[PDB]
Amino acid sequence: MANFFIDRPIFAWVLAILLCLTGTLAIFSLPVEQYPDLAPPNVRVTANYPGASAQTLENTVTQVIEQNMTGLDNLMYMSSQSSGTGQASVTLSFKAGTDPDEAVQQVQNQLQSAMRKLPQAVQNQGVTVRKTGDTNILTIAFVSTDGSMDKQDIADYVASNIQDPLSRVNGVGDIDAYGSQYSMRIWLDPAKLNSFQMTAKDVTDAIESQNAQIAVGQLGGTPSVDKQALNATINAQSLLQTPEQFRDITLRVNQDGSEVRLGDVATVEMGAEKYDYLSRFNGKPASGLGVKLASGANEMATAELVLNRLDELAQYFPHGLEYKVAYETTSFVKASIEDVVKTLLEAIALVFLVMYLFLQNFRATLIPTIAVPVVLMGTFSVLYAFGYSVNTLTMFAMVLAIGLLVDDAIVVVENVERIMSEEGLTPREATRKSMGQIQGALVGIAMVLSAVFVPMAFFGGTTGAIYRQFSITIVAAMVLSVLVAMILTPALCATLLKPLKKGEHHGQKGFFAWFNQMFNRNAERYEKGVAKILHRSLRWIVIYVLLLGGMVFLFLRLPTSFLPLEDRGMFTTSVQLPSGSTQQQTLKVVEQIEKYYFTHEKDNIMSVFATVGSGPGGNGQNVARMFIRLKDWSERDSKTGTSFAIIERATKAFNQIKEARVIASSPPAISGLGSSAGFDMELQDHAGAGHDALMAARNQLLALAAENPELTRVRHNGLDDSPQLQIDIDQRKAQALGVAIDDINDTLQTAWGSSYVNDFMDRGRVKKVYVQAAAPYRMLPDDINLWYVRNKDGGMVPFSAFATSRWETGSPRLERYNGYSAVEIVGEAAPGVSTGTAMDIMESLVKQLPNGFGLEWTAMSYQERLSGAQAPALYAISLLVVFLCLAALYESWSVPFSVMLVVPLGVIGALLATWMRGLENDVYFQVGLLTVIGLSAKNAILIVEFANEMNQKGHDLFEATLHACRQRLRPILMTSLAFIFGVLPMATSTGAGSGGQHAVGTGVMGGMISATILAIYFVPLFFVLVRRRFP
């Protein structure tokens, strides 16, 4: 095919132009983001029962939903939790590859069956089915500088005027709000109600009757009289708006003309619907607004548009109110893209530099400078065709892929240059000769490289998708480069490469002449060394065995991780007070934490956005979450001001706070990924022994795990049991007094708990109406006796006559896994112990527990259980395919063994480098290891192919091998030096994303150095041995 395009340069140019144009269009079209959708589709069903308990919520909502979530497709497992707050969450985790839209549609369809079975209050509150894969782009906090606007006012203004326009931006998918909008609040007073012989049910009925919209009908609705004049819509009373109107709601009118209004028995104010959240920004009350990206759009552009629109809205803000960004991802992703494109351009520049250093021809130097960009455009086109996008992973693969295309261009241009400068052939004739002698080698290289990179695509789970991104990117780049190498590059070498090789060589003096002399001397020394090692094989065979053993040792010593941690610009601090603690104490602890942040780590912090009333382990009054944002990477020191150093200091500082367990942590890149040491287990109760038996079994299992040295940091993710109040309503006594049990239950539910009675309109927006007791009358257990219920005769019966309260213990949050009462016991495998071994130890411990208690692994542990040693099988198949392709290429069964033995040569250097630098065996290291394997394999393939060709034509074995290794020295050195210097900025990058860049740079640098040093000697040795034996 190469000879076809050598005579037709215009055809190759046309194809290159088409590829470049398509690549440009793809670049303009494809999305850009930090990471793609890499997680099994998880769907969460959230139901809210105001004032409910954990037991009541589980009985009436959680179990009902679970029993109807049947018939779902690709459902890995079901996890549910019922919290004492009044929120029940059912999480349905589907298998990887399931369509998220289909999954959420199925979950919604199954929920519709059980909607009527839910309690009326739960239905009124609304049950929403949403994915859990939400990625928050920004967390904007609105704070009143003047102080005129209170927290409730700020939240209402945001929900009214800000949440609407921002949600209409193209890239916005969802906008979470951390504040509660204004809602009409009615605070009942038991003494007043008893004074007027009223009840909470009367108030609820009056509100529902006097605050409603009624559609009467039409004035001339068909059928009508013969000569009806007009047809007009008829309307009736409208929703009440002001709190004063609610105070005028007439409960009853006395026979004397006196009236009893709603304001007479209650206090009406416009407050928040949910008082649980106490969001605070930099010590001042504030409300948050989290915007989440819609799939398929640029997160950077979406964030920019959201900020621009909010700036537009900022012109109409009331005095005092200002919007502050407490969390941003635009800076990190912009820095990542800038670093990737900088590395690509610098790699191209270094390719130019090395090409002019070795070949010393300007046009020959241009030849690869124009061949790499067309391959890049082709790769971008393929990525757009496959539906991919510019991610961190895809960009890293593109950086890795730069080695292969550069290597192909280097080898072809160097071969044609050598033919021109030695045989004196015409540029066209030299190109034809080079293509004739290297044509099959390129196809074999393409096939073996594909076999190197393809198998990692078929791994399962989130790690499987992460590997698939790199695999597809690199394979597309390799195929495009091979196609370009056989089409475009020969045309360039035959067209724009001047025949004056002698003239080009003649005009050489200074550093170029000295470099040529040094290279000639080093090549002579290398050839002499190769001859020496060929004449003495046993020592170097022993050396190879020792290198293999050291490779095994270093692989065993390398810790394993999934993604490196980078200074993302912010970290998160969490606070959890002991159970049964009010939100005032949590606020005090949060104030202490933020004072610490603003005092000591002042030089690095920029803004801390706390949120009392929610956080890890479930929402509650004793749980708080804080988002701490740091300054730009340049401003803070890169030695003592790094995010890791800040959290290291904070954890030491936070561990001295006995009040609550406050722990600082850095957010993971992907929520799905977890630490390799850690594991998740769900100790279930199959026999239905009860909650108390389950808790006792959990305590025993935790004790056993703490005893075992193979398990470290084992704990439950749930909440420990807390005291609760049990009201005993004497049914017989209540009925003897004449009271109705339904009235008692309604009074308790709408007095102590809330009651979403109806809706009202405020400033053109509908807001909820809640009826509940005033704060001082729902605090102590003795506040129950303050209420009075009305019997049949109309008299008021005290609550103490038919009720008694006692203290008991109950779990604040009840959790279920796959429909069984379970507790999530999370632990971490001890260092030096296999994760599978830790899981087996935990399973044995669960066996030691009393019967009826099983175990089920979740998330990462379950994924590991499913994917059992798939990688060894996939790479064994890959090795077999490589062997078959090489045997076909070399027309022998023994020669391919020579190439396959060079794989350990390049991996030992990468292992040694990543071990010395202290890095770990992350996925980036895996990709770099595969790339260095591929490059070493390509070098060995070229060497053995040249040697085999010369031997077949007749050149002895020793002489042929020496000549082949002499010929291949220059291109191998050229490619190795170019790739090393291209990835050197990655290995020494300080700033955003330094983690993955350091990983890839160190791995590639070590691997390439080791390969280019060892292979150039060992490959001739292997070839000579196998050809001597002829097996």
DSSP 899-966: HHTTHHHHHHHHHHHHHHTT--B-HHHHHHHHHHHHHHHHHHHHHHHHHHHHHHHS-TTHHHHHHHHH
**Element holding 646 (H helix, E strand):** helix 643-654
* Token couple for 617: 């382990």
Map tokens 């927290």 to a residue: 151
How far CA 634 is from CA of 320, 326, 330, 343, 630, in Å, comes to: 32, 19, 16, 20, 11
* Structural contact between residues 2 and 8, judged by C-beta atoms closer than 8 angstroms: no
Cα(965)–Cα(161) distance, rounded to whole angstroms?
74
How far CA 656 is from CA of 599, 600, 663, 730, 819, in Å, comes to: 16, 15, 11, 49, 40
Which residues are bridge partners to 93 per DSSP? 42, 77
Phi and psi at 218, nearest 5°, equal: -130, 150
* Structural contact between residues 971 and 441, judged by C-beta atoms closer than 8 angstroms: no
* Structural contact between residues 411 and 417, judged by C-beta atoms closer than 8 angstroms: no
* Structural contact between residues 188 and 265, judged by C-beta atoms closer than 8 angstroms: yes
∠ at Cα 769 (766, 770), nearest 5°? Answer: 150
- At 216, is the secondary structure helix, strand, or coil? strand
* Token couple for 112: 């519709």
> What is the torsional sign of CA 842, 846, 847, 853?
negative
* Token couple for 887: 């045997």
Which residues are bridge partners to 623 per DSSP? 576
Listed residue (976, 878, 898, 910) closest to 943, CA to CA: 898
Cα radius of gyration rounded to whole Å, the chain? 36
Map tokens 């394999």 to a residue: 937
Length of the chain equals 1031
Listed residue (61, 736, 633, 546) closest to 331, CA to CA: 633
Peptide linkage before 223 cis (omega within 30 of 0): yes
Q: How many CA atoms lie within 13 Å of 365's alpha carbon, on the beta-carbon side?
A: 17
- Tell me, rounded to whole angstroms, the distance of Cα 759 from its chain centroid: 39
Listed residue (61, 545, 33, 563) closest to 329, CA to CA: 33
Cα(407)–Cα(368) distance, rounded to whole angstroms?
9
* Structural contact between residues 38 and 462, judged by C-beta atoms closer than 8 angstroms: yes
Map tokens 């002449």 to a residue: 513
Q: Report the relative pairing of strands 765-773 and 182-188 from DSSP bridges.
A: parallel
Question: Where does residue 523 rank: exposed (0-12), middle (13-18), buried (19+ CB within 10 A)?
Answer: middle
Classify residue 781 by its DSSP letter.
Answer: G
Cα(327)–Cα(308) distance, rounded to whole angstroms?
16
Which residues are bridge partners to 88 per DSSP? 47, 82
Cα(909)–Cα(1009) distance, rounded to whole angstroms?
7
Listed residue (319, 321, 286, 289) closest to 306, CA to CA: 289
Cα(144)–Cα(219) distance, rounded to whole angstroms?
51
Cα(151)–Cα(288) distance, rounded to whole angstroms?
11
Map tokens 């701490």 to a residue: 628
Determination approach:
cryo-EM
Cα(586)–Cα(614) distance, rounded to whole angstroms?
11
Q: After which residues is the chain broken (C to N over 2.5 A)?
A: none
Classify residue 349 by its DSSP letter.
Answer: H
Question: Cβ atoms within 10 A of the Cβ of 439, count?
Answer: 15
What kind of fold does domain 722-813 have according to CATH? 3.30.2090
Q: Where are the alpha helices (DSSP H) in 49-196?
A: 54-57, 63-68, 100-114, 120-125, 151-157, 163-167, 190-195
Tell me the DSSP string of 528-559: HHHHHHHH--HHHHHHHHHHHHHHHHHHHHS-
> What is the widest separation between alpha-carbon atoms in the chain?
128
∠ at Cα 468 (467, 470), nearest 5°? Answer: 70
Q: What contacts 898, CB < 8 A, 6 or more positions away?
A: 940, 944, 1019, 1022, 1023, 1025, 1026
**Element holding 748 (H helix, E strand):** helix 741-751
**Element holding 428 (H helix, E strand):** helix 427-453
Phi/psi class of residue 845: alpha, beta or left (left: φ > 0; alpha: ψ in -120 to 50)?
alpha
Question: Cβ atoms within 10 A of the Cβ of 495, count?
Answer: 17
Q: What is the resolution of this structure in A?
A: 3.1
Strands, E assignment, 132-245: 136-144, 172-177, 182-188, 215-218, 233-235
Question: Cβ atoms within 10 A of the Cβ of 535, count?
Answer: 9
- At 679, is the secondary structure helix, strand, or coil? strand
Listed residue (958, 1003, 960) closest to 983, CA to CA: 1003
∠ at Cα 398 (395, 404), nearest 5°? Answer: 165
* Structural contact between residues 386 and 31, judged by C-beta atoms closer than 8 angstroms: no
Which residues are bridge partners to 727 per DSSP? 805
> What is the torsional sign of CA 419, 422, 426, 427?
positive
What kind of fold does domain 184-272 have according to CATH? 3.30.2090
Strands, E assignment, 282-438: 284-293, 321-328
Map tokens 């050396």 to a residue: 543
Q: What contacts 658, CB < 8 A, 6 or more positions away?
A: none
Classify residue 162 by its DSSP letter.
Answer: I
Question: Cβ atoms within 10 A of the Cβ of 84, count?
Answer: 24
Cα(74)–Cα(290) distance, rounded to whole angstroms?
31
What kind of fold does domain 570-665 have according to CATH? Alpha-Beta Plaits (3.30.70)
∠ at Cα 777 (774, 782), nearest 5°? Answer: 165
